[PDB]
Amino acid sequence: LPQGFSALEPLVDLPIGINITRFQTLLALHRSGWTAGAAA
């Protein structure tokens, strides 16, 4: 993580009204089997 200060712009507001308790990220895989580049 780099140093310095930077504010965060609000982007999206959604009136969904549901319950959220657990989550998981999603990636993209491509076959050349499949190879994935560096990411952090």
Added chain:
Amino acid sequence: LSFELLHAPATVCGPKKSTNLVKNKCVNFNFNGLKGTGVLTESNKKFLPF
């Protein structure tokens, strides 16, 4: 056409109202549900888009 009422923000409705703006006069105003009273003037401040 049937209308439903549930535990939700309920943002389904048509036009509220519209009017012309007059400057340099003392008057009441209501912007987006925010009420106030005063005199309106051209503003040189540069607000952020949000």
